[model samples]
Target: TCPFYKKIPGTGFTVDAFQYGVVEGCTAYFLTHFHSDHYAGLSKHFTFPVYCSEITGNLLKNKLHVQEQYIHPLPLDTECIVNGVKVVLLDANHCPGAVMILFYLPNGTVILHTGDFRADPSMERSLLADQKVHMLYLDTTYCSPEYTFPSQQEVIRFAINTAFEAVTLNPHALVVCGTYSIGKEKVFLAIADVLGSKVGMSQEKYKTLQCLNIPEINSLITTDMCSSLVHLLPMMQINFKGLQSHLKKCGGKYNQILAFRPTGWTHSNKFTRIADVIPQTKGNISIYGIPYSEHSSYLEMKRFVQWLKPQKIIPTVNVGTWKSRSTMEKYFREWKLEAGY
Candidate 1:
């Protein structure tokens, strides 16, 4: 609704916003990922050429059936010339086809528009070491200091062990993992590998995985319900009552239910340790809210911001209300002051 990041300073590239039609000096539309919130307002009848990663391009065609000619999918880490402006796509590590785009203007000013990303230490030490970014458009989904959840790998391993222990206790327990149409692929996939079972989801989700074009990921998905004991369900189904119904549907083939919910808000700063996470259980149902998130934590955003210290720090999320936007700004000040920048 707001136009804070609707346009880049010098270029005609309108990024990540197809909701508002053709902002001032707009030439092309650049998408950072295939997430609906980030790619909202995109349609089949769009006017301008869409720039995105190849994976995102495949998703656009497969999911939305957007015209291929208008979609310009660029290769990762390779600098490409777009209307005389040098642009490069970097991995976001948030989800499949997620990207952090770097734009080098004619006068040598470098601007980085991170669509949505899980900030990684490797990207800091390697990816952006040489390129000095002037302005940073950050993904501030969990920008507050209260949102410092555990790392993805750490949470993934713990979630896997939780599932393993649950299944070990009840050999025939049906493990149901809650996931969105696209997110939490790593968490559920890891559970399948550790448990030596296949993942089950809807046919649309299987189709979505196929669009990703990664063999290891595509191979793990199965549509057969009974073949895979560990099945991935939509987030709505994971509700304690809803999950109870799912357990009932098993018809005693499985004695109990072991379910995992992948969410960032689960492991808040209120609880400092993983061992403190007690499963919410009632009768034969146990649901674990695991700390698995695609968005960067507060500490991660702190480290990333201080590392670059770009001239302008813009947030792409939690900025709708002035009060919320002001809160996001305060974190920037705190991070900058602590780093003595």
Candidate 2:
């Protein structure tokens, strides 16, 4: 079985996790982002020194309450030596403070952990200059060829326009946007700026955004439910039926509700261009599944792997199952063969 904790053999340093008390003896640790899945088993009591971006470090201190002594913030795109390994952090383009980690070992082995990232041109250029990579730890969340979608920025525009159209159709309706705690702040902020409205979110979510220090966003967050025409709700809390039932007692004060789920999964089985919009309506609410995603699509991953041309590709997810192993192997072989690598 592939363990959650990834250790650099003979280096005594760890990446992403200290699962099963592994951190007690590791020389150091590196965190790619503050996402919960990547940070599983970590807590305020974690004692080992951690290396990450300054924004990630701030999140660790403020959100996770991790001690300052254990947080080491490294500037992006700069090389630094920690425990004899040359390390560089690159922007992941997934969310605020997300990073892709590059490790150049003493024996000339260049290992990369992509963490979770969308495909970006600058990141590709940086790796292209390096010319060679020994091993790559890939984020294969959407590793199947069927998962194709448009760029996040374009999809964000689509989503913002859709919300505007929804409100225009139903003047009394409330626009509820579903988003994760950290990843989709850009979408919310864009809606607020374009729609000329503030966003209402939970106190915890507001605090997380405050750490980013964007005055525009800080000025638009509010606790009052009716403070804005649009409301930002946790992704899991977005259900048309549930909200419709709750709002029934309002007695026509708010006659309709429109929800938007900005995610890449809507196009999981089909190719969706940036110009397309998929919507489903139930009762008085309409739900939209926008193609905004933080992870690379299957084609994007193939192109990235072809560019890196790594000798070995280690998938960061679903490694414990034979199906996952076979699927990844098949995709890699196909990608390499198609690219003539």
Candidate 3:
């Protein structure tokens, strides 16, 4: 749940570590996404040249109150010079404002930094110039073999189907999708979009979503309470206690609530197949933990690394434990070397 705040060797650029003080040669900073884990220490106080996509820049400015001069917004899929190195941003498909950064250092080193991503076919087809990446700074959030979750599209479809069925059974039943301040919106957005359910969120969250400028989000968001049966709230608000208070506040307009917590952690090798996904119920609350993950699964990660064939790798997560970190290194070794299977 913590970002390692990685520093790419020789780039003089620190990736996602504002809390850790001072890298001897660090001059520029890179933000992969706007997640709390990634942007933890970035307050208005710290000053550094931070580079990220435009949506992330908007988040840093509005959410963190960081000054404009310090935040550099790079357009996605376009090459630009940063610290005398050619750099480009590509859609991470992890979340909005998330990007996988490609860099060509002046010394002829080609590096790709995947901030936090779900592996997609687009990564290979659109990779810049088909150039070999010498180094890959990987997002190992789910780097273990046990994490065999469904694809982002599959999970989104599951959530939509699940929610649609729930609401269809009882149109008056309140359906809430769990979310982060800046998190898995696709699940709920698809739900509301297809079901034609009016979506409600607190003004604060609505204001932040507005910054993304997504056409669907802009059209669906409403600030008023109980105005819509389907709502998106912070994950904390989905609990029974939270729901009880929310129910009381809504004045018993709905007798029951169905909540969805869409995340990769929802699926596991204990029961690897898609059929293994199950819903949980305690008291009056019915909660479904779907495999709605943003990070690549173990198999997905292997395919990515195997395809890239980077000569070297640097993991961005799970680096604290020697055993956890080392086994991943072993996996990286085989993926880069095996070449077949």
Candidate 4:
């Protein structure tokens, strides 16, 4: 009844492509989040029509800028029928825009898809405790004990703390962090809030901030904010000197400047550049390695499995190995193996 009812290879007739074909008839699909991995392939691959909560829908349209024809907006926790399939969107505290999808089938089957989620009982205690799910598809990225991750809020706080400490130490300080455009906004907002008062931003960054529509953030001063107190610089080198030039032009405009970004892989050459830039500055400069990651860790995945006690447990967003399988494979694995009585 749940979809992905195929026979698993070598596991009797437990996993196969036919079960995937059945779910493809999914009649109704609900998106838990707007991350590229979750919803990016829908338009091209799926014509069955998908649904999501209002916030998630807006994010898909506004942030991802996808076509509207494919989305069916719904309210959170509202049960709706799609080709006779019932679905509910539950809270999944993995990111700013994330949810756990619940599926109800006519054959008296219920399944939960815990997409890259975290255990934030404060936010989702009721949803987790109440659901009598027949199966749970978990994000077991951190199934091993060796992998441990701090809570989302904790990591954000750590990033801000490091930036604050670095700025205090260096009078003419600049801190460069590598982060994604969408995810790092909150971290930057936290840093700005702690600094108190308006901080300068580049024209592009200011434009980006305006698009997000968060006013609680201090007044974002563009080049205009670079009076004799603060200077805003772009994260790139081409703009770095211009930022300095603007600072000097303002004649002691700003004593310290902070650059926020989340760069990829410290082992890469680009990471080395961050280290190299320190000596070039006249003021004390330091880098912050807050260790922010997007994908769920291994432990979170295990916890999800334990909580749902699904009939099967499958892994997607992965290729070969035990986790190999399409989204459909993931569902079947959970339905047949992980579900509890």
Candidate 5:
């Protein structure tokens, strides 16, 4: 019944987490990323030796305060034997340092854990060369046809253009862009580069971005609120009530407020397509939710499965939700036919 953790039969190697606690005879633990949902019960007190990307390891030590001795950093694209199981890490392209794990078991079965990632064509080429994948643990976040959205680049372009248009129309307005503390740095950095202005951020966000070591982004962050026309705020801050409260407190300090939220959830409605860019208004603020997703869309997932043609597919999310398993299985059957294989 446990969907997150997978045991490679007699190999004793575990993927993602141990859930309740460390399995008494489990050999090693592998983490896909630092996202809270994936790293659920992991914390500073974690006792087992965990394997992940260098950036993920650093975040564990620096952000989560996990002791370094318990974290092992896996070099990307390199195959290393962990407890007699050959493991290779590939770029997940979800967030900085996120990875897709490919495990070659002693029993001759090859398993792939996608972690969380938007597909990268280059990475796909590498995987396609591997010929066979015995099993696939898929990230089915957008496993429904309703979740279709533009590619990450297209969505980012839309967000940037929308932000600039808003600012141009309301010259004295404050532009607030919402993002996760880590993942969407590209959106903010692109906005900053295009506007040729510093992006104001909280000390916490600034420090996190600084740790990422992107010189271009680190150089553009400003702690002073009034120093930049555009501000980078946490995703939570761009909500309707939050924006209203902030503008109320500002007391006319800025002529207008344009808020942008870049997420796949913008197409939450089945009727809405990615091409539709309607902004939700709350008082003086115009909030735009862009279709930027870090996970593969339904069509993308189908294409990936068609290419890999795994012996079996296990979805990583919504396994416990009502009818989720059956619904996903139905989609898989439909996708198989659509994929023509």
Candidate 6:
């Protein structure tokens, strides 16, 4: 449902909204993942018997509280028919329930939508084995050759080591890290899992994690991870003055306090001023910026495009206009020899 070209008369944006008119007549619609970007807008616009993996369905139900009546749970690699179109849900490996949707149109067009994905070995292998892909809608968030990401395990290790070592090294210090409530709660939980005490998270994250199947770490996740060692509570409940007062009160009580804030976007420097709250007290403040993510980097995305050999490519999940389009086109032109399609 792309290549749409409708524009408002005066406003400088295209408004050809992709709307699902009738489920009974049109071909099947598949959702590759349940990320807020991928599925959040759909609940209001389209509900055409969304086809996705069972795990993704569960994630939608658990995280977004989406009704089950709208979702049709399909397994990975299993082909199913809706209306007359054929569909398959393949693991994208970007997240716990992420998937790459393959749609087989009645007229024989094969569209492979790589919802958000990573160049994990499994996902690479899955893409390598695919041969009949026509249009490959890609996630080109980091479609530059220089973009690289550390492994998930490595990221967890870094976050944990930083949190634990900070407390052990500077007993009277406060460490605050920013993450996402919906996605990066695992980082906070991983810290608490390593340390006996729990670190509290934002209510949004708490509710988001409440729907997951992870049992080992969820119990250890505190709504306020710093409560055990420091006084910083959820940002909503505590103001600037309250945070400062609590940190002062905790000076003699605990050696160190850790506070983690979950962020939605990575590059937004909106909360940088929060560092000002921590005075030059015995409990000094340290903010940690960890660049760990689940999405595929530019090199990985290029490898995916090379493996699929698509006739055309389209990028989504980016800001405003498509800034990375020309770079991706250059990559496509350079790799055209190997790209069979």
> Which is the leading candidate under TM-score?
1
234-254 per-residue lDDT for model 3 (tens digits): 887777788777777778688
Better of 3 and 4 by lDDT: 3
lDDT of 5 by residue, 1-341 (tens): 33334665667667776465866567677888878777767788988889988888878888888898899998988879888778889988898888889888788888888988776557667754766888888888888877677777777787778777777776678888887747877777777767778888778777666656465665688888776777877788888888877666655778678887877655364666555768898677888777677888777777778777777888887777769889999988876787765
For candidate 4, the 10 contiguous residues with the lowest summed lDDT are 7-16
* Candidate 5 residue runs with Cα over 4 Å from true position: 1-5, 213-215, 248-253, 266-269, 272-275, 336-341
Candidate 6 lDDT, tens digit per residue, 1-341?
43332211122222112242342333344566656545534542345456677766776666655677776788777777655556677877666667776767776777776677776556556633756776776777776655555566766776677677767776655544444323555665677555556655566665655555566655566565446442224444333444456567544655444555432225432243322222232234434445556777666666666766788766664434555566667777887766655
Candidate 1 overall Cα lDDT vs. reference? 0.82
Tell me each candidate's RMSD, in Å, in order.
2.0, 2.6, 2.6, 8.0, 2.5, 7.1
**Residue 52 of model 5: what lDDT?**
88
Worst 10 residues of 1 by lDDT: 266-275
Angstrom error of the Cα, residue 49, model 3: value is: 1.9
Q: Report the lDDT tens digits of candidate 1 across residue range 1-341.
A: 52867578778788888887666667888988887877888777776899998888998888888888899999898889998898888898888888898889999889998888888777886558886888899999888777867777788878888888878877898888887757668888888888888898788877888888676765687998677888878888897799778777766678788888877765354765776676888888888888777888888878888998787788888777999899988878888888887
Q: Please, what is the TM-score per model?
A: 0.93, 0.90, 0.92, 0.65, 0.90, 0.71
Score candidate 6 by TM-score against the native: 0.71
Candidate of highest lDDT:
1
Consecutive 10-residue window with the lowest summed lDDT within model 3: 1-10
Quote the RMSD, in angstroms, for model 1: 2.0
Question: Where in model 1 is the C-alpha error above 4 Å?
Answer: 267-269
Clashing pairs in 6: 171-255, 179-262, 179-263, 199-225, 200-222, 200-223, 200-224, 200-225
**By descending lDDT, how would the candidates be arranged?**
1, 3, 2, 5, 6, 4
> How does residue 10 of candidate 2 score in lDDT?
50
- In Å, residue 310's CA in model 3 sits off its true spot by 0.8
Cα lDDT tens digits for candidate 2, 1-341 = 22543766556667787455754457888889988877777779998888989988989999988999999999988889998778889888888899988888888788888888886656767744755888888888889878777776777778778778877777787777887758877777787767788888778877888776565665788877666777777787678666776467445668888777776666343754557556688778777777677888887877778877888888887677899889989988987787786
Q: Which stretches of candidate 3 lie over 4 Å from their true place?
A: 1-5, 266-269
Worst 10 residues of 6 by lDDT: 7-16
